[PDB]
Ligand binder design. Structure first.
Ligand SMILES: NC(=O)C1=CN([C@@H]2O[C@H](COP(=O)(O)OP(=O)(O)OC[C@H]3O[C@@H](n4cnc5c(N)ncnc54)[C@H](O)[C@@H]3O)[C@@H](O)[C@H]2O)C=CC1
Ligand SMILES: NC(=O)C1=CN([C@@H]2O[C@H](COP(=O)(O)OP(=O)(O)OC[C@H]3O[C@@H](n4cnc5c(N)ncnc54)[C@H](O)[C@@H]3O)[C@@H](O)[C@H]2O)C=CC1
Ligand SMILES: O=CNC1CCCCC1
Ligand SMILES: O=CNC1CCCCC1
Ligand SMILES: [Zn+2]
Ligand SMILES: [Zn+2]
Lengths: 374, 374
């Protein structure tokens, strides 16, 4: 009864930076060739969505944000072969076109069809499927999940197990898979190693889960909010440190604690200073440091390249290095088989209409991952 | 007839920065426990020795520099078990104590006994074996090869094949092994890949040799001195580019030439800007960049961490990543088995007394690696 027709529904529109979302009616066009329209069931609030509000992460406005979500296919455009109406799906903020050099490379996952490097805020075809007050509204990362319905390109959606609990597995669309993969795929944490994790939010906790799954002997959580420490320990941290408790810079503290530097460190905050601190705290000859946090737009860090010349490895990654469409269904299958837990990350549940309260909870430091239900 | 006695011999003393070496008589004390005195046969002129003269590399002065060399053991101190008088040996500017956490790690080679991180310019016991005009003179990297005789710690010397030609294998003491290992061990260049090498001196040419040995399909040499291009092609480069010939930044040129970025890049010059350019020219999702060149003292580079967040890997290494005492004898054996060539690196051979002429050749752009013969 809606296939081929415009859907009027509620969405959370961001009209300008540093303002509350506006919950109001939008028009969602029907899918074009190779597009899929999704009825949203649940979406997480990730710090990257807040970065759009704050101007840390620049993408065109006005916009429908939201990228960590799960829903049910309402209809498919011509030529779609990988999902059908009624299927449970997770939108992919990093596409997997399967055809570019990156998709073909064994390690790479940052598909060249992504809307991160040169943001347009559109569908792959350079147009939008959203109108609000008669005005076109931008998409975000080809997902836009803060809406009762969205339209995504086929390369930006994965079909998942029909018995999946969507109010949990939405986290596989971003924060869990990013943190977990950063440890197990990008860093390749080894048995018996010492790890340091900077930032103990939903992504930082998922890095800890991955370090523990890899068999690290020590996992040192680092956060300036000591309220984050109890849950970090529950999911695997062996110790936690608050830099503001020390007279010395935390790189020196962590080097001392690890008898000369950690094996693996992770920046999971988004600050230039902690990216350099995290590099410095890994062992100078064989340490590895992974940047996960998002830096403020266009800003450069400063660092001494002798930190690398001694033998450190520095890398970053999007989405935990996972090739998104191949990996999301397998991660859902692993969750259904109890291979990792998502409940530790979910501290609050709210209806979609209370989105602004959910962002207030994140900004206050009180939540890890609020899940919004449509 | 010299064992146990002070040797008076000639050496090239650097009394202050930005002056010629002074060729004059020095006194070399006999080796103490766990020390080895070596009669020098050949030593190369590396850019790192010039960095001491120019102040790019800070180490205590006055100093006997030189670190890329080969000689014959004249005597051993009490307790030495790994070399004996008459053995051919290469001094190791990165020691291999075998007992620290780095020596025990499968990947690491920057042994914690090194004199690079916190330069003291002494023997391991904190004293010097050199006197000149009655003044104590510092050591350099535990080697000090610009002298007819030197004294090194046992952990800073390797015994090599008694039939090895020392006027060639001295390059395995630094420049060849550094560049070759930077490609084959640190970057782990893959078959069929595209590489970019910034800097076509002795070390960059050895990176090219390593990329070719690893089966790279394309090897792009980058240098502002086009006189370096002919020899770079002889040893494996498929193309060379001079940044000065282009209106656009060379990272943009290399990205276009490689249809979206190279697989592996190497900075083998020692400039902050070319370290950032080499990182940028590797493919953003799966590229790897290795810093080999030595930065000017105490200076920081500036970079945008989104270069790493997309997926790049940035690393650096000392001495090609080779564990020094284990690897140098094997590299000499490989050379004797014709597995790689050293003659392409050697453009000039001069008596030791012409050391300053050798440095003038390096600074003018005319030489790759002058070998000084004692
Ligand atoms: N690379 C990728 O693909 C992804 C990157 N992100 C980014 O990862 C980062 C973390 O995201 P979430 O876990 O959702 O954020 P979050 O805000 O819940 O967690 C960040 C933590 O960092 C702590 N923190 C803030 N400043 C600190 C400081 N100076 N020192 C030590 N701790 C400090 C906070 O107290 C907080 O607990 C964000 O920058 C996000 O945008 C998130 C998912 C995907
Ligand atoms: N990481 C390690 O263990 C080692 C580091 N080094 C360092 O590696 C570097 C290279 O050493 P060598 O090959 O002996 O030096 P070299 O001086 O013979 O070669 C450097 C090359 O860089 C070129 N060059 C200079 N400025 C340039 C620019 N803006 N753009 C492009 N090319 C430029 C020069 O024309 C020259 O051909 C030096 O910094 C040296 O100190 C050397 C050996 C060991
Ligand atoms: O949080 C989800 N996606 C992020 C990935 C890192 C760059 C900004 C967008
Ligand atoms: O060239 C030999 N050794 C170099 C190694 C890199 C730091 C400066 C000294
Ligand atoms: Zn692709
Ligand atoms: Zn050691």
């Amino acid at each position: 009864s809606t296939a081929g027709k415009v859907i009027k529904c509620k969405a959370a529109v961001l009209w300008e930076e540093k303002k509350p979302f506006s919950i109001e009616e939008v028009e969602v066009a029907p899918p074009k060739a190779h597009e899929v329209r999704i009825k949203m069931v649940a979406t997480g609030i990730c710090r990257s969505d807040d970065h759009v509000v704050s101007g840390t992460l620049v993408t065109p406005l006005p916009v429908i944000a939201g990228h960590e979500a799960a829903g049910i296919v309402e209809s498919i455009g011509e030529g779609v072969t990988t999902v059908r109406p009624g299927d449970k799906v997770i939108p992919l903020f990093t596409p997997q076109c399967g055809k570019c050099r990156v998709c073909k490379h064994p390690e790479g996952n940052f598909c060249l069809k992504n809307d991160l490097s040169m943001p347009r805020g559109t569908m792959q075809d350079g147009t939008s499927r959203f109108t609000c007050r008669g005005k076109p509204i931008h998409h975000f990362l080809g997902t836009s999940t803060f809406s009762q319905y969205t339209v995504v390109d086929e390369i930006s959606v994965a079909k998942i197990d029909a018995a999946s609990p969507l109010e949990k597995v939405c986290l596989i669309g971003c924060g869990f898979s990013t943190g977990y993969g950063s440890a197990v795929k990008v860093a390749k944490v080894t048995q018996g190693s010492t790890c340091a994790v900077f930032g103990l939010g939903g992504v930082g906790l998922s890095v800890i889960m991955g370090c523990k799954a890899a068999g690290a002997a020590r996992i040192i959580g680092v956060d300036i909010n000591k309220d984050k420490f109890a849950k970090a320990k529950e999911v695997g941290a062996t110790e936690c440190v608050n830099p503001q408790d020390y007279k010395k810079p935390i790189q020196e503290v962590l080097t001392e604690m690890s008898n000369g530097g950690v094996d693996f460190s992770f920046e999971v905050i988004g600050r230039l200073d902690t990216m350099v601190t995290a590099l410095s705290c890994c062992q100078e000859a064989y340490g590895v440091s992974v940047i996960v946090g998002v830096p403020p737009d266009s800003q450069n860090l400063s660092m001494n390249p002798m930190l690398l010349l001694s033998g450190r490895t520095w890398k970053g990654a999007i989405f935990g290095g996972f090739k998104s469409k191949d990996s999301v269904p397998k991660l859902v299958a692993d969750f259904m088989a109890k291979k990792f837990a998502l409940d530790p990350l979910i501290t609050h549940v709210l209806p979609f209409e209370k989105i602004n309260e959910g962002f207030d909870l994140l900004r206050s430091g009180e939540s890890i991952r609020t899940i919004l239900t449509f």
